[PDB]
Amino acid sequence: MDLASLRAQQIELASSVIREDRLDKDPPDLIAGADVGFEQGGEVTRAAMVLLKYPSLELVEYKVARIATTMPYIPGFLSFREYPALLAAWEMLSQKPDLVFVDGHGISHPRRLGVASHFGLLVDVPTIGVAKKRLCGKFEPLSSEPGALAPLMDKGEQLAWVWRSKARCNPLFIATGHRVSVDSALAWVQRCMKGYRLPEPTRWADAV
């Protein structure tokens, strides 16, 4: 069972996610944005990484990796196909960021191991999940103003902050990836806003 040991790996990694602040460099000098997806109906995994300066939020570099998908889609295990592409893009970076924002779920994931937690943990860098849609859990519907804020709850636990970053946009689901608390994850995303729906690092990562 490659399937039973996949599952085993998963619950171990979910266990090892750090849910408290552990930045080695606060404030960061350099942050990064990350995006992953699939091309060729799943045969190629593509990941984009972006480096910005903090606090300016200036683009200084970006890199795209494309690799062949080696694992097929298996429900619950998307982070294992996504992870290798993010790793490849990461290793193209000419310097390493102090904090990483991933376009995707942190612990706010059925298995507590969204791609942002998966990546953050294997690479061991402070990481935040900035997701565009709910995956699991529940929240009190948000009022329509910018700054509307509700906790995302599952099983008695807060997995994320649901935060309307911008008027007339759908909200963000901001969760710890690795080595960032849920409340600091929100704080850091808010610090990395300019005038769009997404914070700059993942906006940039999607744009390249």
Numbering used by the authors: 1 to 208
Wording from the paper:
To investigate the substrate recognition and catalytic mechanism of EcEndoV, we solved the crystal structure of apo EcEndoV. In order to obtain diffraction-quality crystals, the 9-residue, C-terminal fragment was truncated. The resultant construct is prone to aggregation, but still retains the deoxyinosine-specific endonuclease activity (data not shown). This construct contains residues M1-A214 (named EcEndoV-SF) and it forms plate crystals in a condition containing PEG 3350. The crystals belong to an orthorhombic system with the space group P212121, and each asymmetric unit contains two monomers. Both chains are almost completely intact with no internal disorders and of good electron density: chain A is visible from M1-V208 and chain B is visible from M1-S210. The enzyme displays the ‘RNase H-like motif’. Two of the most important elements for substrates binding and recognition are the PYIP motif consisting of residues P72, Y73, I74 and P75, and the hypoxanthine-binding pocket comprising hydrophobic residues Y73, P75, and L78 and V115 (corresponding to I122 in TmEndoV). Additionally, four conserved glycines G76, G104, G106 and G114 also participate in the formation of the rigid pocket and their backbone atoms are involved in hypoxanthine recognition. No Mg2+ is found at the cleavage site. The r.m.s. deviation is 1.4 Å over 204 Cα atoms between EcEndoV-SF and apo TmEndoV.
